[PDB]
Amino acid sequence: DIVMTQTPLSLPVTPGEPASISCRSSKSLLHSNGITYLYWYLQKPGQSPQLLIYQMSNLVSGVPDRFSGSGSGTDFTLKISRVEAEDVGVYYCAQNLELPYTFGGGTKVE
Amino acid sequence: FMRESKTLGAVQIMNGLFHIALGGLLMIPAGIYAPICVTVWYPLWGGIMYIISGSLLAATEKNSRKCLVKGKMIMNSLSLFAAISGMILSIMDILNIKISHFLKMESLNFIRAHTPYINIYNCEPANPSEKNSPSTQYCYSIQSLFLGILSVMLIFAFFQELVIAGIVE
Amino acid sequence: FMRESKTLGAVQIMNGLFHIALGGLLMIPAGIYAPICVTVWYPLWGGIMYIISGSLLAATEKNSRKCLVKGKMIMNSLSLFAAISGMILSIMDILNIKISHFLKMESLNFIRAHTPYINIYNCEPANPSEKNSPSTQYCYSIQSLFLGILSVMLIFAFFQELVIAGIVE
Amino acid sequence: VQLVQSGAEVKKPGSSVKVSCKASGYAFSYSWINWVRQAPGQGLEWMGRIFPGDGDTDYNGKFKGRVTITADKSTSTAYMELSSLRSEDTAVYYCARNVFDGYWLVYWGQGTLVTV
């Protein structure tokens, strides 16, 4: 299938300056349509999962304003201008172009 | 075999109005790459040519005029040229849409900017998450309707060309 | 006028071909709730009876032993009934498509088995921000195309019915 | 729109477990039901999906076709049917609703955990 690798695995929380989540695909995800599909998930205990970013171009309403994200096609990077302790959790990188669907291993942030 | 020399003029007039109306109706925005039938603007001038040819013969039934017969046979030659050109373009368009996209054929802004983010040539689910989606079903219906319209146009053009070949003598 | 009614037999034949071809074209599964015009199968029988009448209309244009006078009244009455029924159906269908429908008119199964998940009557997602999706544009294009087809069919039916009414008088 | 799921159930290895993912507030036949499992030690993992409108189903193919999924139109609820559960299969399962044309899996479910 398709396997994703992310780093750092831990990434200890530090508000403001350091915020960088990177994920990559081993199959060079590209459908030659000019866009690449990418999704981000946040798992913090207390509530059900929710969508964060969809094909790294726009964000669902209600998202914190200090969020962003971009990519080139092979290596995908997630950047936050100012990380906060309220939206703490893990980041999941996902690709949906061929069966079977595979989800990222996640980065446990404490 | 040479049945009547006048009753076919009304038929030619009605087929000319047919082509004009079809050309006017098929100007709806459909994809960035408009079909080659409308990019050339062939149907409108073709239909006006057929309407002029019909008006030149439907309600005359006269002879002994050199200019009349000269113009009649010249415009008949242009009618044959228009018919064969329409056949060629219809065959090319149906082969392009049915088999695979191979021609761009960019069109005017007023019929392209309306739908600048849709495709009507190869619209299949890129990802399995939209295998059965309203967008792909709507595009499939559009493609089927376009194929049916092209088939009807080709059949009518073939019938009209056969009529002309029977009337050229 | 009645002086030159012979030339209109081919016109009525072409009108019958119109009705049959357009019925076959609209037979395609364009949504679960098909327009009432195609559910009643009016165009097919209307075109076939126009074809029959036109074949009998241009038989001899004279008084044979018993070939034309028997039909000249009954088939004319049938043509008038078909014309009034067709214009009534057209003016009902244009209202049923412009205004929210109050007739179901479920489509037949053997065509519904192909595209059974197309909705045109209510294709507006509850999300106001979702209006920019290509699905809404596709639905609007389908609605505009259907409106154009219905308007063209109504206009042509009115023209043919008025010319038939004038001729039979 | 609201999604209601049954509570967690405790089972034993080799048995069978069923979970009811009740759906309401939307058109049940106009959304592909997606199920994703989450096990301790790693992230999420897709297992299967079903379309109740036409009965079309898809499978991950990782295992030898042990996943059996069915849907009921009269109740608009999908049921879980797995045979001979093992210890390594102990995980929490979530049923998610998909939205076509971009919003792939925006809507999630409450989820139900099973222990054997």
C-alpha to C-alpha distance for D45 and A67, rounded to whole angstroms = 26
Q: Residues D65, D87: contact at Cβ < 8 Å? A: no
Q: For residue C139, which amino acid is it?
A: C
D56/B132 CB distance under 8 A = yes
- Most distant CA pair in chain A, distance: 40
What's the token pair of residue B104? 């761009």
Task: Give D6's contacts (C-beta < 8 A, 6+ positions apart).
Answer: D19, D20, D21, D112
Dihedral of alpha carbons B159, B160, B161, B166, sign: positive
C-alpha to C-alpha distance for B56 and A78, rounded to whole angstroms = 73
What's the token pair of residue B25? 């109706």
Q: Residues D69, D80: contact at Cβ < 8 Å? A: yes
C-alpha to C-alpha distance for D95 and D110, rounded to whole angstroms = 8
Q: Residues D33, D52: contact at Cβ < 8 Å? A: yes
User: Where are any strands of DSSP class E within chain A?
Assistant: 4-7, 20-25, 39-42, 50-54, 58-59, 70-71, 75-79, 91-95, 102-103
Identify the closest residue of chain B to D53 by CA–CA distance: B132
Q: Which of D32, A63, C18 is nearest to B132 (CA)?
A: D32
Task: Give D91's contacts (C-beta < 8 A, 6+ positions apart).
Answer: D37, D38, D39, D40, D113, D114
Helical packing angle, C9-26 and C134-168, nearest 10°: 160
- CA D49 vs CA B23, B103, C84, D69: distances in Å: 46, 38, 53, 8
Looking at the DSSP bridge assignments, the partners of residue D36 are D46, D94
HSE-up (13 A, CA, CB side) for residue D112: 21
D101/B130 CB distance under 8 A = yes
Q: Residues B16, B50: contact at Cβ < 8 Å? A: yes
C134/D102 CB distance under 8 A = no
CA angle D69, D72, D75 (to 5 degrees): 135
C-alpha to C-alpha distance for A66 and D93, rounded to whole angstroms = 31
Owner of token pair 């302790």: A85
Q: Which residues of A touch B127 (CB under 8 A)?
A: 31, 37, 96-98
Q: Which of B116, B100, B98, B119 is nearest to B108 (CA)?
A: B116
Looking at the DSSP bridge assignments, the partners of residue D78 are D21, D71
Q: Residues C157, C83: contact at Cβ < 8 Å? A: yes
C133/D102 CB distance under 8 A = yes
For D95, other C-beta atoms within 10 Å of its C-beta total: 24
HEC string of chain B? CCCCCCHHHHHHHHHHHHHHHHHHHCCCCCCCCCCHHHHCCHHHHHHHHHHHHHHCCCCCCCCCCHHHHHHHHHHHHHHHHHHHHHHHHHHHHHHHHHCCCCCCCCCCHHHCCCCCCCCCCCCCCCCHHHCCCHHHHHHHHHHHHHHHHHHHHHHHHHHHHHHHHHHHC
C-alpha to C-alpha distance for A91 and A107, rounded to whole angstroms = 6
Q: Residues C105, C120: contact at Cβ < 8 Å? A: no
CA angle D50, D53, D55 (to 5 degrees): 50
Q: Which of B73, B27, B24, B74 is nearest to B46 (CA)?
A: B24
In this complex, the residue of C9, C14, C148 whose CB is nearest that of residue B14 is: C14
Task: Give A86's contacts (C-beta < 8 A, 6+ positions apart).
Answer: none
Phi, psi of C47 (to 5 degrees): -65, -40
User: Before A18, cis peptide (omega within 30)?
Assistant: no
Burial category of C30 from C-beta neighbours within 10 Å (exposed 0-12, middle 13-18, buried 19 and up): buried
- CA C71 vs CA B108, C12, C53: distances in Å: 53, 16, 9
Owner of token pair 């544009």: C137
C-alpha to C-alpha distance for D42 and D22, rounded to whole angstroms = 27
HEC string of D30-75? HCCEEEEEECCCCCEEEEEEECCCCCCEEECCCCCCCEEEEEECCC
**Residue-wise DSSP of C72-141:** HHHHHHHHHHHHHHHHHHHHHHHHHHHS------BPPHHHHTTS-----SS---S-GGGGGSHHHHHHHH
B126/A98 CB distance under 8 A = no
Dihedral of alpha carbons B28, B29, B30, B35, sign: positive
C-alpha to C-alpha distance for A4 and A22, rounded to whole angstroms = 10
A31/B128 CB distance under 8 A = no
Dihedral of alpha carbons C93, C98, C103, C107, sign: positive
What's the token pair of residue B108? 């005017």
HSE-up (13 A, CA, CB side) for residue A45: 3
Q: How big is chain D by its Cα radius of gyration, in Å?
A: 14
Q: Residues C21, C153: contact at Cβ < 8 Å? A: no
C117/B139 CB distance under 8 A = no
Side by side, the strands of the sheet bearing D9-10 are D9-10, D112-115, D92-97, D33-38, D44-50, D57-59
Q: How big is chain B by its Cα radius of gyration, in Å?
A: 20
**Which helix (H) or strand (E) element contains residue C39?**
helix C36-39
C-alpha to C-alpha distance for B76 and B166, rounded to whole angstroms = 12
HSE-up (13 A, CA, CB side) for residue B54: 20
**Which helix (H) or strand (E) element contains residue C49?**
helix C42-57
Q: For residue C50, which amino acid is it?
A: Y
Any A CB within 8 A of D105 CB = yes
**Chain A contact probe: residue of B124, B127, B129, B130 with most A CBs at under 10 A:** B127
Q: Residues C37, C43: contact at Cβ < 8 Å? A: yes
Owner of token pair 């069923």: D18
Nearest-Cα distance to chain B for A29, in Å, is 12
What is the CA C31 to chain-centroid distance, rounded? 18
Any C CB within 8 A of D55 CB = no
D44/A39 CB distance under 8 A = no
For C4, other C-beta atoms within 10 Å of its C-beta total: 12
Given resolution (angstroms) = 4.3
Q: Residues C72, C1: contact at Cβ < 8 Å? A: no
Any C CB within 8 A of B7 CB = yes
Q: Which residues of A touch D108 (CB under 8 A)?
A: 48-51
C-alpha to C-alpha distance for D71 and D46, rounded to whole angstroms = 18
Identify the closest residue of chain C to B58 by CA–CA distance: C7
In this complex, the residue of D43, D58, D104 whose CB is nearest that of residue A92 is: D43
What's the token pair of residue C140? 């609007």
- CA D87 vs CA A39, B84, C69, D84: distances in Å: 31, 74, 92, 10
A54/D44 CB distance under 8 A = no
Phi, psi of D21 (to 5 degrees): -105, 85
C-alpha to C-alpha distance for C142 and C136, rounded to whole angstroms = 10
Q: Is D20 helix (H, G, I), strand (E, B) or coil?
A: strand
DSSP state of C146: H
Q: Which residues of A touch D103 (CB under 8 A)?
A: 51, 54
C148-161 CB burial, b ≥16 within 10 A, e <16: ebbeebbebbeebb
C135/D101 CB distance under 8 A = yes
Task: Give C86's contacts (C-beta < 8 A, 6+ positions apart).
Answer: C42, C46, C157, C161
Neighbours of chain D (3+ CB pairs under 8 A): A, B, C
C-alpha to C-alpha distance for C42 and C44, rounded to whole angstroms = 6
